[PDB]
Write a protein that binds this ligand. Structure first.
Ligand SMILES: [Zn+2]
Ligand SMILES: [Zn+2]
Lengths: 374, 374
């Protein structure tokens, strides 16, 4: 009964929206946070635990999966969902960002050649090959393959990368639409580029809306610009995107970045922060992050957060988790990660509820006042 | 309603027994395997997962817990059960073995002085202090503090360590019995020493039965002697212990060691093998252990073991777990460990059932024929 892709906005407050994305493998509540499942695992969590925290969708990294265990191998093993045991929607990034940030790079208009950061094996990516890999994975939301430009970006380099990206967005569209099984069961998002420059962002938006996509991502942020500049860029960039389609801010971010981005019209988020910070001993709380290794928690019997409903905060103390993290114990990573992901989902839930009730502006004020009292 | 400690033998076949140990925090089915929970965690598993595999009791290491997080700290945090979230029985070793094998050692008749292997801090252990620490932990089965003699052991050194151990067993008895809350709610096991020498084992047994204990451990094995010599030592040592009390072989071991020890009258086991081997990529199966990193599993969609009822074998393939282990992913350690512990508990269940039905001899033959076909 479920549709391929249907975004519906149930309530709005200013630029903020709340609603649902209906897909064949499930419903995504927006604004949505996607836990990151890099190499076919949300690190230190079983998929059932990921779901129990409230996640409706997770993200997979195309660049990592193509290096290990391999895209064709995953297809032969019945696709990513079956492989890793997550049966709800999966969004896959294009891999273009990690090629720039992780691999040993030839770049051209056809695509990119690079050496694996793991073993120096040679690989290739292009609009067509990236769409094909995401198809071999079985991805539900496919990202167009673009060209990332490092930070900071000179206007010429930002416009160079943006224009080639828009040509690649058209090739991504066509590659997606050529493959019937993919085009009937998955969705395709386009990526706005153009750095901090308003004119380039607008040309990017026009090109993408001319091609037509199921959703639109804001690319090229959370790469060093700081929150003030990111918000300033969001202020004029998001209204350029089609209003009736989801808006996806890639790689963001800290809780306060998420709230501010929702205030500016963003519907979807992903970040390694809750998982990676958790393994490193940082727990998010409504009173700000805490460093659980600090000596002040060594005999603290309170849970990580006094209001959190997650199973970790129901069962174990700060003192216990302090001990596990300082001891290097795997269970420390597990509990910290589950709490952090549950905290992110509770944030998204409070965001959605406050928009639905027309008190999101008050929620954002209240959130910041307490989170930054620390 | 539950008693402090009541061992009841429901069925026997040759020297093998099956039955139950009833304690205030739960019933222990014997023969029993205890997962090892070193520093207040069975590594990579939540306690609920430990219980879901079938474990009735776990082991804690007194030497590690006294170094981190500290015995008094655990008492202040309401004891080990509450600290780590395991509410069923816990057996604590005495710490004497790790003092010899891990610490930087002065040894005397009063006790032992050593430096922590973690930071060089100075600590002390004695019969009285070991019983007190196990009390501060809240341990359900307390081990007498003994003196371990390295392997191999000359007769003089084996008899030296054994005789002092028996004097320490009397001091452990008295220290335990002096502390009313401990003596009314916990149990105390004595440890037979005496290496491979029949006469020393017999003198040890006589001394321990003269003092009186709730259970009797066979110490000084699984330290390099090989299975043939261990079995030969068990052949004459176990019948020296009181028949109507549990028999605990410390630190054993591989599945085939467990079966052979049950054939010789052992009721209780502990080993780091299922947990530590799991993290290292070795999975136990009814057809012998497999090294999941081997390339032959890279596209194998079968579960780790074709008969195993554990949740890992219900949900994930060898190929997936192969990928996680080779990638260094925490979830690889989690899944391997859960399967290995579940496999050990299924072994103990099959042992108990076959003894109950008077076909344990046939089970042991059948087990070995298949496990060592490999
Ligand atoms: Zn929590
Ligand atoms: Zn299994």
């Amino acid at each position: 009964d479920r549709p391929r892709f249907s975004f519906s906005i149930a309530a709005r407050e200013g630029k903020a929206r709340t609603g649902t994305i209906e897909m064949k493998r499930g419903v995504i509540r927006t604004p949505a946070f996607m836990p990151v499942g890099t190499a076919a695992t949300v690190k230190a969590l079983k998929p059932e635990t990921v779901r129990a925290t409230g996640a409706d969708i997770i993200l997979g990294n195309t660049y990592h999966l193509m290096l290990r265990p391999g895209a064709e191998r995953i297809a032969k093993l019945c696709g990513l969902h079956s492989f890793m045991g997550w049966d709800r929607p999966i969004l896959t990034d294009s891999g273009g960002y990690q090629v720039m940030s992780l691999s040993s790079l030839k770049q051209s208009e056809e695509g990119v050649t690079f050496k694996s950061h793991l073993d120096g094996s040679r690989h290739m990516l292009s609009p067509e090959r990236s769409i094909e890999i995401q198809h071999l994975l079985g991805s539900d939301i496919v990202m167009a393959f673009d060209e990332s430009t490092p930070y900071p970006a000179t206007p010429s380099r930002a416009a160079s990368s943006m224009e080639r990206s828009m040509r690649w967005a058209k090739r991504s569209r066509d590659a997606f639409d050529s493959r019937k099984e993919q085009a009937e069961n998955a969705a395709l998002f386009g990526i706005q580029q153009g750095s901090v420059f308003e004119n380039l962002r607008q040309q990017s938006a026009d090109a993408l809306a001319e091609i037509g996509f199921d959703g639109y991502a804001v690319g090229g942020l959370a790469v060093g610009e700081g929150q003030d500049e990111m918000f300033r860029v969001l202020d004029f960039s998001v209204p350029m995107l089609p209003d009736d389609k989801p808006h996806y801010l890639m790689g963001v971010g800290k809780p306060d970045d998420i709230v501010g981005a929702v205030e500016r019209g963003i519907d979807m988020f992903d970040s390694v922060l809750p998982t990676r910070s958790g393994r490193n001993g940082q727990a998010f709380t409504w009173d700000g992050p805490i460093n659980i290794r600090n000596a002040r928690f060594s005999e603290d019997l309170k849970p990580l957060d006094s209001e959190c409903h997650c199973a970790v905060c129901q069962k174990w103390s700060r003192a216990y988790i302090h001990h596990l993290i300082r001891a290097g114990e795997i269970l420390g990573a597990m509990l910290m990660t589950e709490h952090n992901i549950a905290f992110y989902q509770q944030l998204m839930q409070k965001i959605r509820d406050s928009i639905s009730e027309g008190r999101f502006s008050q929620f954002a004020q209240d959130f910041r006042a307490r989170y930054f009292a620390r």
